[PDB]
């Protein structure tokens, strides 16, 4: 709109819009220690 007053345009040959860009948010590395003992291992060796 601020560029409409100063210069003129043709028809838009294609339509676009504003989109948001981000990394593909996987962030997930499951393992042995996360699923086995998510608690303190001091508790586990006290149980031992």
């Amino acid at each position: 709109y601020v560029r409409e007053k100063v210069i003129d345009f043709s028809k838009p040959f294609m339509t676009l819009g504003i989109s948001i860009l981000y990394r593909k948010p996987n962030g997930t590395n499951p393992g042995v220690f996360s699923f086995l003992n998510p608690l303190s291992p001091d508790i586990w060796m006290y149980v031992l």
Partner: peptide, 23 residues
């Protein structure tokens, strides 16, 4: 002794009493 580790002292006291009472 953690947030769930507070039962260990009661376990140790009960084990000492179970050793001392039985024979």
């Amino acid at each position: 002794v953690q947030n769930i580790g507070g039962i260990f002292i009661v376990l140790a006291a009960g084990l000492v009493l179970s050793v001392f009472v039985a024979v």
